[PDB]
Amino acid sequence: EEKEILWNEAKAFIAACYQELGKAAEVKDRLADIKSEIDLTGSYVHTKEELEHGAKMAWRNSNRCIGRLFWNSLNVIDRRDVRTKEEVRDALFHHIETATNNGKIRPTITIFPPEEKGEKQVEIWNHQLIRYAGYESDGERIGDPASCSLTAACEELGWRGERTDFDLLPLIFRMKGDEQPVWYELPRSLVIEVPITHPDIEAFSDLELKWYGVPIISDMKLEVGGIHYNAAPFNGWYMGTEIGARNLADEKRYDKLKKVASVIGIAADYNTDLWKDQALVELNKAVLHSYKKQGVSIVDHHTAASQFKRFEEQAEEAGRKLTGDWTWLIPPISPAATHIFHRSYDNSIVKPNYFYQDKPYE
């Protein structure tokens, strides 16, 4: 059954991919080769063209992503050749450097060897390549609560954080054959961060907020034509609300709205004053201002929604069905100010795609 699933996924992908690339005549010969290869080895190897276009198709098919207009300009780095933990580490360092691009962020994915028999070759423990640690001991909360379990796992392995609110977690991953993951501290010269200030309110800097420049998701599996690339970190640039309305505002994250209310000079006492709403707007204005001033790529939710409208239009013009998850596509502030709010979306799963997977810790 294993191999039949593979063959069926392969047929569908190759036909679709080659059609999009204007290579439809080469499909039969390619499929023949693949069938024989599956016959002998139990799997098949993507050409560099297939792998690159597959990762792009996967982004295009990601229902929860508002940023998909730019799917075709994804920078795909093929690292299926890595075999050592130093090579993995260096590939991850390289991804950070080339994606960051001195602040002019390049959407990039680095693809490591795929699962073989469901056997991972490389298992990345980080949720993002750059993320802050979190601690909760004896009532006392420090850093990003979303990182508490991973932070504890790292500290079991001999890492120790300084216990600021913004400790960078080390890269941590396990190779096939190793019982334990290895970890490596991130070189600070590779990691751009942005201090959060407000365009008009000088006191905003008293909050001493900052965030990292580049979100590099490293716990999803890329599936292309039945091949499962469990290790394939990818990044875009942030939409400002991710930082200002979720990471810094959620009560189960940095929980900063009361502090923001205080520095902008409004009371945080009455629901009817809409102080949370006002604080959200100023925090989100500060985030966009701060990234722009530093020269680090970022998009606001209005511009992002306008770009997504164009993606919708482009899909229709290309004769491709559009899929989407309305609940994730609406921004978490002013959603009804976007066209997305007033439309519906088919949340069907189309492959290639990116899929969430279990974390070894918990």
Ligand X SMILES: C[C@H](O)[C@H](O)[C@H]1CNc2nc(N)[nH]c(=O)c2N1
Residue numbers in the known binding site for heme are 65
If DSSP codes are grouped into helix, strand and coil, which group holds residue 323?
coil
Residue placing its CB nearer to ligand X in the complex, 117 or 342: 342
Catalytic residue among 30, 60, 68, 131: 68
Residue 208 and residue 261: Cα distance in Å, rounded? Answer: 15
**Which of the ranges 40-48, 123-131, 205-213, 337-345 carries the binding residues for ligand X, by CB under 6 A?**
337-345
Give whole-number Cα distances, 261 to 118, 269, 361, in Å: 50, 10, 37
- Residue 351's CB is within 10 A of a number of other CB atoms, namely 17
What whole-number distance in Å separates Cα of residue 131 and Cα of residue 133? 7
Contact 75, 98 (CB under 8 A): yes
The yes or no reply on residue 308 touching ligand 1EV (CB under 6 A) is no
Residue 68 falls in the annotated catalytic set? yes
Binding residues: 65
Dist CA 259 CA 203 (whole Å): 11
Q: What angle do CA 106, 317, 312 make, to 5 degrees?
A: 55
The answer to whether 247 and 239 have CB atoms below 8 angstroms apart is: no
335 interacts with a copy of itself by CB under 8 A: yes
341 binds ligand X (CB under 6 A): yes
Catalytic residue among 59, 71, 183, 237: 237
* Complete DSSP assignment for 18-87: HHHTT-GGGHHHHHHHHHHHHHHHSS----HHHHHHHHHHHHHT-TT-TTGGGGGG-EEEE-TT--SHHH
Find the Cα–Cα–Cα–Cα dihedral 227, 231, 237, 240, rounded to 10°.
Answer: 110
Q: Is 30 a catalytic residue?
A: no
Q: Which one among 114, 161, 215, 352 touches Cl ion, defined by CB under 5 A?
A: 215
Which of the choices Cl ion, ligand X, ligand HEM, none does residue 163 contact, using the CB cut-off of 5 to 8 A by kind?
Answer: none
Q: Which does 344 bind (CB under 5 to 8 A by kind): Cl ion, ligand X, ligand HEM, none?
A: ligand X
201 counts as binding a copy of itself under rule CB under 8 A = no
CB of 360 to a copy of itself, least distance (A): 25
Pair type for strands 140-143 and 193-195: unpaired
Q: Is 237 a catalytic residue?
A: yes
> Does 334 engage in binding with a copy of itself (CB under 8 A)?
yes
**Interior CA angle at 31 toward 27 and 34, to 5°?**
145
Instruction: Establish whether 65 is a catalytic residue.
Output: yes
* Residue 109 touches which of ligand HEM, ligand X, ligand 1EV, none (Cβ within 5-8 Å per kind): ligand HEM
- At residue 302, what is the residue type? H
Pick the closer one to ligand 1EV by CB: 6 or 232.
232
Least CB distance from residue 361 to ligand HEM, whole Å? Answer: 18
- Partner from a copy of itself, ligand X, ligand 1EV, none contacting 215, C-beta within 5 to 8 A by type: ligand 1EV
Which residue in the set 236, 240, 324, 352 belongs to the binding site for ligand 1EV (CB under 6 A)?
Answer: 236
Determine, following the binding rule CB under 6 A, whether residue 342 of this chain makes contact with ligand X.
yes
Q: Which residues bind ligand 1EV (CB under 6 A)?
A: 215, 217, 234-236, 238-239, 242, 247, 356
Catalytic residues: 65, 68, 237, 242
Site residues (vs a copy of itself, CB under 8 A): 245-246, 249-250, 257, 271-274, 276-278, 280-281, 284-285, 288-289, 292, 300, 302-303, 306, 326-327, 330, 332-337, 341
